[PDB]
C-alpha cells in the first residue's frame, strides 16, 4: 500500500522537478537574453544590468528551489504514507 | 536491437576492453595519420597546395581564428593542435560510418561502428580535454589560484552553480557527442529491420544528413574545447 | 541594382550604382541589396561604408556621423564629411585616432577602419 | 520649430532617438544654407 | 553500456598518438605554410 | 544478405547525392581558393620582377 | 482506498506545483526581461520601472502561491480521504 | 469505488490548476512585459497603458479563476462520486 | 466499472481545462501585449486596435469556451458511462 | 471489460482537446499579435492585413477543428471499443 | 489483454494529436505572425512573402500530418494488438 | 505481461511523437518566421537566407527523425517485450 | 513484476524523448531564428555567426542528446529490473 | 511491491529529465539568440557578450544537470524502495 503511495510520491516529485526545471531554465534563458541584449546595446551598462538580472533570476531560481524542497518532502518525507 | 554488445571484447591487465571500439579508433587514427603524412610529404609553401593541404589549412585557420578571437594565440599555442586533432578525429570517426559496412547476422551487424557510439571513446576525449584545460588554468593561475577562480567564476555568490557548470563541461561534452552518434547506431539498426527494397530510402536519407551531423558535432566539440580553454585560462 | 548616392552636406559626393552596401548603424551592423524595405538609421560616429560597386572593386568610405536612408528608388548616405579609401592619409588617421577630442578621435578611427587598418 | 501637419518606413534605433539626433543636424544644415545664401547675397 | 571500460585507456592512448602527430607533422607545418 | 544489399543501395544513393550536389560546391571551392593562391604567388613573382 | 487516494493526491499536487513553477519561472523571466531592457535603455527609469515590474511579479507569484497552497491542501489535507 | 474516483478527481484538479497556473503566469508575464516596455519608452503613458493592461490581465486572471473554481468542483464536489 | 470510467473522465476533463487555460492565458497575454505596445506607441489609433484585438481574443476565448463545454460533457454527461 | 477502454478513450480525447486548445489559443494569439501590431503601425492597412491573418488563423483553427473531429471520434465512437 | 492495449493505444494517440496540434497551431501562428508583419511593413512584398510562408507551413503542416497518420495507426491498426 | 508492456510502449511512443511534433513544428515556425521576416526586409537576400534556414531546419528535422525512429522502436519493436 | 517495470521504463523513456525533442526543436529554432535574422540584417556576417550559433546549438543539442542517452539506459538497460 | 516502486521511479525520472530537457534546451536557445543577435549587430562585442551569456547558460545548464542528478537518485537509488 505504501508501495502505491510512494510510487505516486515519486511521480509527483518528478512532476514538481520537471515543472521547476522548465520554469527555471526558460525564465533564466529569457532574463539572460535581456541581459545579453542590454550589454550588447549598451556595453557600459553591464554593471547596472546585473541588479535587474539577479532580481529576475532571484524570483525565477527561487521557485525552482521551492519545488526542489517540496520534491524532497514528496520523496524523502512523503505525506500520507 | 541489441543496443550495446561490443564485439571483439577481450581482457588484459585485469580490465576489459571493447575490441570493436578500439579497432574503429585505430582505423580513424590511421586515416588521420595517412592524411598528416601525405600533407607532410606534399606540404608546399611556394607551390600550389594539394587537396589535403587545403583541408588542413582551412581547419587550422578556423581553429586559429577561434583561439585568437577568444584567447590570444600567444597564450594558447598548445590548444590549436588539440582543436585540430579533436576535429579531425571526431569527423573521421563519424564519417567512416557512412561507408556501407553493415550486413545481416539474423540481427544487423556492422563491421565498422562509429567509436563515438561507445561511452569509453567520448568519455576519454571529454576527460582528456577536461584535464587539459584545468591544467592550463592551473598553469596560468596557480595550483591554489585556479580552483578559487573556478569556484568563484564570474559571480561569487553563485559558487555552487559554477561547481556544477564545471562538472557539466566534461559530462555534456562527452554525452552530447555520445548520444548523437549512439542514436545513429540505433537508427541504422532500426532501419535494418525494413526489407531491402524499402530499407535503402530511410537509410540513405538518415546517413546523408548524418554526414552533416557528424561534421557539426566535430566542429562543436572542437569549438567548445577552445571556448573552455579560453575560459579556464583567463 | 541599387541606386546608391552619397551626399555630403556641402556637395553630392558619389552617385554610382552598386550591388551591395554595408555599414554599422547605431543599432548594429547592416547590409543593403536591391529592393530592401525603406529604412532610416544613424551611422556610428566612427562608421565606415562599403559599396559593392558592380563593375570595379568595392568602394570603402570613411564617413563622419552620417545618416543612412533606404528608399524604393535609391539608397542615400547623408554625410557631414566623408573620404574615399584612396584619399585617406594613413599617418594622419593614425595620429587622430589617439586624439583626446571625441569628434577628432572618432573621425580618425573611421578613417582607419575605411582604409583597412 | 513649428510642427506643420499636412495631408498624407522603418527606423533604427527607434524613431524618438533617431529624430532627436537628427534635429540638431537639421538646424546645422539650415544654418549652413543661411550662411551660403548670405555669402551669395554679399557677392 | 554507460559504464566505462578499459577501452577508455585504449582509446586515450591512440588519441594521444594522433595528438602527437598532428602536433608536429601537421600544425607546425601548416602553421609555417600559412 | 538482404540488409547488406539494402544498405548498399542506400550508400549508392548517398554517393550519388553527394557527388551531384555536395561535391560540386566543395571541390570547386577548394578549387577557387587554389586558383587564388596560385595567382597570388603569381603577383608576388611579378612584383619581384618589378 | 487510502493508499490510492494518497497516491492520486500526491500526483495532483505534483501537477499543481509543476504548473505553478512553470508559470512563475517563465512569467518572472518575461517580466524581468522587460525590466532589464527598460533599465538598459533608460537607466534613469530604473525607479519608475519597478512599479510595473512589481505589479507583474505580484500577479505571477500570486498564481505561484495559490498553487503552492492548493498543493499543500492536496498532500497534507487530502480532500475526499 | 469512491477511492478510484477521488484519486482521478485529485489528478484532474491538479491538471486544471497546473494549466491555469502556467497560463496565468505566462500571460501575466507577457502583458507585464508589454506594460514595462511601454512605460520605459513612454514614462508619462503608464496611465493610458494601465487601461489595456488590466483588460489583458482581466482575460488572463479570469481564466485562472475559472480553473480555480472547477478544480474545487473536482476536489470538494467531485461530480462523479 | 463506472468508477474507472468516472476517474478517466475526471482526468480527461482536467486535461481539457488545463490545455484550455494554458491556451487562453498565453493567447490573451500575447494579444494584450500587442494591444498595450500599440497603444503605447500610437495612442491615436487606440480604437482601431480594438477591432483586431477582440477578434483575436474572440478566437482565444472561443477555444477556451469550447473546451470548458466539453469538460462539462466529460464530467457531468460522461460519454460511454 | 471495455470500461478500461472507455477510460483510456476519455483520457486520450482529453489530451487531444488540451493540445488543440493550447495550439489554437497560442497560435491565433500570435497571429492576432501580428495583426494588432501591423494595424498600430499602419492603421490604414487593416484591410490588407486581414488577408494573411485569416490565412494563418485558417491554418491554426483548422488544426483545432481536426482535433475536435478526433476527440469526438475517441469518446463517442471509441474505434478500439 | 486487448483492452489494456487498446486503452494504451488510445492514450498514445491522444498524446500524438495533442502534440501535433500544439506544434502545428503554434508554428503556424508564428509563421503567420511573420507573414502579417511583413505584409504590414510593406504590401508589395506579399507576393514574395508567400513563398517562405508556404515552405514553413509545409514543414509545420507535414509534422502534424505525420502525427495524424500515426494516431490513425495507433487507434485503427493498434500495433502489438 | 505482453499486454502491459505493449500499452506502455504505445503511451511512450505517443509521448515521443507528441514531443517531436511540438518541437519540430514550433522550431520550424520560428525559423520560418525569421526567414519570412528577412525576405521581407531584404528580398535580394532570399537565396542567402536559405542557407542558415535549411541548416536550422536540418537541426530540428534531424531530431524529429530520430524521434520518429525511436517511436517505431517502441511501437513495432518494443525493446522490453 | 518485470512487465510493470518495463512499461514504466517505456513511459519514462517516452517522456525523456518528448521533453528532449521539445527542447531541441524549440531551442534550435530560436537560435536559427537569431542566425537568419542576423544574416538578413548583415548578409556578410554569415561567416562570423556560425561560431556563436554552433556554440548555442552545441548547448541546446546537449540537453537533447544527454536525454537520448538516458532513454537508452531506461529502455535497453532499465536501472531497475 | 518493488515493481510498482521501480515503475513509478522510472516515470518520475522521465518527467524530471523531460522537464530539464525542455527548460535547458529552450533557455539555452533563448540566450544564444541574444548572443547571436548581439554578435551580428556588433561583431567586436563577441568577447563582451560571452561573459553574461555563460552566466545565464551557466544557470540554465545548472537547472538541467541538477535535475539529472535527481533522476539518478530516482532510478539508481529509488528512495522508498
Ligand atoms: C523564498 O521563500 C519562499 C517564498 C515564497 C513566495 O511565495 C515567493 C516564491 N516565488 C519567488 C517563487 C513569497 C510571495 C508570495 C506572494 C503571494 C501573493 Br498572493 C502575491 C505575491 C507574492 N509574492 C511573493 O514573493 C515574491 C512569500 C510567501 C510566503 O508564504 C509562504 N510568505 C512570504 O513572506 C515571508 C513570502 O514573501 C517572501 C513562498 C515560499 O514558500 C515555500 N517560500
Ligand atoms: C488574493 O489571492 C487570491 C487571488 C485570486 C484571484 O483569482 C487572482 C489570482 N491570480 C493571481 C492567479 C482574484 C481575481 C479573480 C478574477 C476573476 C475574474 Br472572472 C476576472 C478577473 C479576476 N482577477 C482577479 O485578480 C486580479 C480573486 C478571486 C476571488 O475569488 C475567490 N476573490 C478575490 O477577492 C479577494 C480575488 O481578488 C480580486 C484567487 C484566490 O483564490 C485562492 N486567491
Ligand atoms: C467567470 O466568468 C466566466 C467567463 C467565461 C468566458 O468563457 C470567458 C473565459 N475566459 C476568461 C478564459 C465568457 C466568454 C465566452 C466566449 C465564447 C466565445 Br464562442 C467567444 C468569446 C467568448 N468570450 C468570453 O469572454 C467574455 C463567457 C462564458 C459564458 O458561458 C456560457 N457566458 C458568458 O456570458 C455571460 C460569457 O461572457 C460573454 C466562462 C466562465 O465559465 C465559468 N465564467
Ligand atoms: C464557438 O463555436 C464553435 C466554433 C468552432 C470553430 O472550429 C472555431 C473554434 N476556434 C475559434 C477555437 C469554427 C471553425 C472551423 C474551422 C475549420 C477549418 Br478546417 C479551418 C478554419 C476554421 N475556422 C473556424 O472558425 C474560426 C467552426 C466549426 C464548425 O464545426 C464544428 N462549424 C462552424 O460553422 C458553424 C465553424 O465556424 C466557422 C467549433 C465549435 O465546435 C464546438 N464551436
Ligand atoms: C481541413 O481538412 C483537413 C486538412 C488536413 C491537412 O493536414 C492540414 C491540417 N492542418 C492545417 C492542421 C492537409 C495538409 C497536409 C500536408 C501534408 C504535408 Br507532408 C505538408 C503540408 C500539408 N499541408 C496541408 O494543408 C495545409 C491535408 C491532409 C490530407 O490528408 C490525407 N489530405 C489533403 O489533401 C491533399 C490535405 O490537404 C488539404 C488534414 C485533415 O485530416 C483530418 N483534414
Ligand atoms: C510526409 O512527408 C514526410 C516527411 C518526413 C521528414 O522527416 C520531415 C518531417 N518534418 C518536416 C516534420 C523528411 C526529413 C527528414 C530529415 C532527416 C534528417 Br537526419 C535531417 C533533416 C530531415 N529533413 C526532412 O525534411 C526536411 C524525410 C523523411 C524521410 O524518411 C524516410 N524520407 C524523406 O525523403 C527524402 C524525407 O524528406 C522528404 C518524414 C515522413 O515520414 C513520416 N514523411
Ligand atoms: C550544486 O548546485 C546547486 C544549486 C542549487 C540552487 O538552488 C540553484 C539551482 N538553479 C541554478 C537551477 C541555489 C539557489 C537557490 C536559490 C534560492 C532562492 Br529562495 C532564490 C534564489 C536561489 N538561487 C540559487 O542559485 C541560483 C542554491 C541551493 C542551495 O541548496 C540549499 N544552497 C545554496 O546556497 C549555498 C544555493 O545558492 C547557490 C540547488 C542545488 O541542489 C541540487 N544544487
Q: Which atom of ligand 5 is nearest to the CA of K24?
A: 12
Q: Considering only CB atoms, which chain F residues are within 8 Å of B51?
A: 30
Nine-digit cell string for N34: 541574444
- How many Cβ atoms from other residues are within 10 Å of residue B46's Cβ? 8
Does the CA dihedral B65-B69-B75-B79 come out positive or negative?
negative
Expressed in Å, this structure's resolution amounts to 2.6
Q: Considering only CB atoms, which chain M residues are within 8 Å of B175?
A: 62, 65-66, 69
Residue with cell 497603444: I39
How many CB pairs below 8 Å do chains J and K form together?
A: 176
Stated as kind and residue range, the H or E segment containing H50 is: helix H46-75
Enumerate residues 6+ apart whose C-beta is below 8 A from G63. G20, G23, G24, G27, H20, H21, H24, H25, H28, H64
Q: Tell me if G15 CB under 6 Å of ligand 1.
A: no
Give dist(CA H35, CA H46) in Å, integer: 8
Those chains having 3 or more beta-carbon pairs within 8 angstroms of chain K are: C, J, L
Stated as kind and residue range, the H or E segment containing M64 is: helix M46-75
Q: Tell me if L62 CB under 6 Å of ligand 6.
A: yes
Of N23, N56, N79, the CB nearest to A31: N56
Nine-digit cell string for L65: 527523425
A69 shares contact with chain G (CB less than 8 Å): no
CA-nearest residue to D16 within chain C is C41
Tell me if C20 and M43 make a contact (CB, 8 A cut-off). yes
Q: Cα(I32) to centroid of ligand 2, in Å?
A: 19
- CB K18 within 8 Å of CB J18: yes
Give dist(CA J81, CA J7) in Å, integer: 11
- CB L47 within 8 Å of CB K51: no
Helix axes A2-41, A46-75, angle to 10 degrees: 180
Nine-digit cell string for F35: 586558383
**SS3 for chain E, per residue?**
CCCCCCHHHHHHHHHHHHHHHHHHHHHHHHHHHC
CA-nearest residue to C72 within chain L is L42
- CB A49 within 8 Å of CB G36: yes
- How many Cβ atoms from other residues are within 10 Å of residue G47's Cβ? 8
- How many Cβ atoms from other residues are within 10 Å of residue D33's Cβ? 11
By residue count, chain I amounts to 81
- What is chain J's percent helix, strand, coil content, to nearest 5? 90, 0, 10
Stated as kind and residue range, the H or E segment containing C25 is: strand C21-25
Residue among A74, A81, A34, A76 at smallest CA distance from A54: A34
**Which sequence spans correspond to the domains of chain C?**
2-115
H55 shares contact with chain G (CB less than 8 Å): no
Give dist(CA J47, CA J65) in Å, integer: 26
Tell me if residue J10 falls in helix, strand or coil: helix
Q: Which atom of ligand 6 is nearest to the CA of K66?
A: 42
H contact test, residue of G52, G54, G60, G77 with most H CBs within 10 A: G52
Tell me if residue C88 falls in helix, strand or coil: coil
Q: Where are the beta strands (DSSP E) in chain K?
A: none
**Distance to chain D for C68, nearest Cα, Å:** 10
L42 shares contact with chain K (CB less than 8 Å): no
Tell me if I4 and H2 make a contact (CB, 8 A cut-off). no
Give dist(CA B171, CA N68) in Å, integer: 11
CA-nearest residue to E3 within chain M is M73
Nine-digit cell string for I51: 477591432
Give dist(CA K79, CA L13) in Å, integer: 11
Stated as kind and residue range, the H or E segment containing L33 is: helix L2-41
Q: Considering only CB atoms, which chain C residues are within 8 Å of L43?
A: 35-36
Residue H2 DSSP code: H
Residue among A27, N8, M45, N69 at smallest CA distance from L8: N8
Cβ-count burial of H29 within 10 angstroms (0-12 exposed, 13-18 middle, 19+ buried)? buried
Cβ-count burial of C111 within 10 angstroms (0-12 exposed, 13-18 middle, 19+ buried)? buried
Cβ-count burial of N55 within 10 angstroms (0-12 exposed, 13-18 middle, 19+ buried)? buried
Nearest-CA residue for atom 33 of ligand 3: I65
Residue among B138, G55, G69, F16 at smallest CA distance from H61: G55
Give dist(CA C34, CA C48) in Å, integer: 20
- CB A59 within 8 Å of CB G32: yes
Pocket test for ligand 6, best of B199, B205, B211, B213 (most atoms within 8 A of CB): B205
Q: List domains and CATH numbers for chain A.
A: 1-76 (1.20.20.10)
Please state the φ and ψ torsions of residue C23, each to the nearest 5 degrees: -170, 160
D contact test, residue of C40, C67, C71, C75 with most D CBs within 10 A: C40
Nine-digit cell string for L45: 537576400
Residue N79 DSSP code: T
Rounded to 10 degrees, what is the CA torsion of B51, M54, M13, B109? 0
Q: Tell me if N59 CB under 6 Å of ligand 7.
A: yes
**SS3 for chain B, per residue?**
CCCCCCCCCEEECCEEECHHHHHHHHHHHHHHHHHHHHHHHCCCCCCCCCHHHHHHHHHHHHHHHHHHHHCCCCCCCCHHHHHHHHHHHHHHHHHHHHCCCEEECCCEEECCCCHHHCHHHHHHHHHHHHHHHHHHHHHHHCCCHHHHHHHHCCCHHHHHHHHHHHHHHHHHHHHHHHHHHHHHHHHHHHHHCCCHHHHHHHHHHHHHHHHHHHHHHHHHHHHHHHHHHHHHHC
Domain C2-115, classified CATH 2.60.15.10, yes or no: yes
Nine-digit cell string for C53: 560597386
Amino acid at each position: 500500500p505504501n508501495a502505491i503511495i510512494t510510487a505516486g510520491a515519486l511521480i509527483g516529485g518528478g512532476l514538481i522537478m520537471g515543472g521547476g526545471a522548465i520554469g527555471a531554465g526558460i525564465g533564466d534563458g529569457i532574463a539572460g537574453n535581456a541581459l545579453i541584449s542590454g550589454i550588447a546595446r549598451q556595453p557600459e551598462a553591464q554593471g547596472r544590468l546585473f541588479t535587474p538580472f539577479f532580481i529576475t533570476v532571484g524570483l525565477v531560481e527561487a521557485a525552482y528551489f521551492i519545488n526542489l524542497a517540496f520534491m524532497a518532502l514528496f520523496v524523502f518525507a512523503t505525506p500520507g504514507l | 536491437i541489441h543496443v550495446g554488445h561490443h564485439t571483439l571484447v577481450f581482457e588484459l591487465f585485469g580490465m576489459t576492453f571493447n575490441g570493436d571500439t578500439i579497432l574503429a579508433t585505430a582505423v580513424t587514427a590511421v586515416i588521420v595519420i595517412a592524411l598528416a603524412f601525405y600533407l607532410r610529404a606534399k606540404v608546399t609553401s611556394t607551390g600550389v597546395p594539394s587537396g589535403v593541404q587545403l583541408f588542413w589549412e582551412a581547419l587550422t585557420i578556423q581553429m586559429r581564428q577561434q583561439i585568437e578571437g577568444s584567447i590570444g594565440m600567444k597564450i594558447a599555442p598548445f590548444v590549436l593542435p588539440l582543436s585540430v586533432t579533436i576535429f579531425v578525429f571526431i569527423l573521421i570517426s563519424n564519417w567512416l560510418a557512412v561507408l556501407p559496412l553493415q550486413y545481416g547476422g539474423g540481427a544487423a551487424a556492422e563491421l565498422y561502428k562509429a567509436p563515438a557510439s561507445d561511452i569509453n571513446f567520448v568519455l576519454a576525449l571529454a576527460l582528456f580535454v577536461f584535464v587539459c584545460y584545468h591544467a592550463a588554468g592551473i598553469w596560468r593561475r596557480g595550483i591554489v589560484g585556479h580552483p578559487i577562480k573556478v569556484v568563484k567564476g564570474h559571480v561569487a555568490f553563485l559558487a555552487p552553480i559554477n561547481i556544477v557548470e564545471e562538472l557539466a563541461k566534461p559530462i555534456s561534452l562527452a554525452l552530447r557527442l555520445f548520444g548523437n552518434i549512439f542514436a545513429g547506431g540505433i537508427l541504422v539498426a532500426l532501419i535494418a529491420m525494413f526489407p531491402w527494397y524499402i530499407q535503402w530510402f530511410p537509410n540513405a536519407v538518415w546517413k546523408t544528413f548524418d554526414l552533416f551531423v557528424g561534421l557539426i558535432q566535430a566542429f562543436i566539440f572542437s569549438l567548445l574545447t577552445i571556448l573552455y580553454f579560453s575560459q579556464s585560462m583567463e | 541594382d541599387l541606386n546608391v548616392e552619397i551626399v555630403a552636406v556641402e556637395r553630392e559626393l558619389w552617385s554610382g550604382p552598386a550591388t551591395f552596401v554595408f555599414t554599422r548603424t547605431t543599432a548594429g551592423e547592416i547590409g543593403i541589396l536591391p529592393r530592401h524595405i525603406p529604412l532610416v538609421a544613424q551611422l556610428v560616429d566612427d562608421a565606415m561604408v562599403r559599396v559593392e560597386r558592380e563593375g570595379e572593386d568595392d568602394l570603402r568610405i570613411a564617413v563622419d556621423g552620417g545618416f543612412l536612408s533606404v528608399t524604393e528608388e535609391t539608397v542615400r548616405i547623408l554625410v557631414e564629411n566623408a573620404q574615399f579609401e584612396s584619399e585617406i592619409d594613413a599617418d594622419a588617421a593614425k595620429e587622430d585616432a589617439a586624439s583626446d577630442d571625441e569628434r577628432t578621435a572618432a573621425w580618425g578611427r573611421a578613417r582607419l577602419r575605411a582604409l583597412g587598418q | 520649430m513649428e510642427v506643420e501637419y499636412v495631408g498624407e518606413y522603418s527606423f533604427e534605433p527607434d524613431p524618438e532617438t533617431l529624430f532627436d539626433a537628427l534635429l540638431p543636424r537639421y538646424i546645422a544644415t539650415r544654418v549652413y544654407a543661411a550662411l551660403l545664401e548670405a555669402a551669395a547675397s554679399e557677392s | 553500456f554507460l559504464i566505462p571500460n578499459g577501452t577508455f585507456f585504449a582509446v586515450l592512448i591512440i588519441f594521444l598518438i594522433v595528438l602527437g602527430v598532428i602536433s608536429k607533422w601537421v600544425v607546425p607545418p601548416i602553421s609555417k605554410v600559412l | 544478405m538482404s540488409i547488406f544489399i539494402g544498405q548498399l543501395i542506400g550508400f549508392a544513393v548517398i554517393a550519388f547525392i553527394i557527388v551531384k550536389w555536395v561535391v560540386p560546391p566543395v571541390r570547386t571551392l577548394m578549387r577557387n581558393q587554389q586558383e587564388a593562391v596560385r595567382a597570388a604567388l603569381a603577383e608576388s613573382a611579378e612584383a619581384a620582377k618589378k
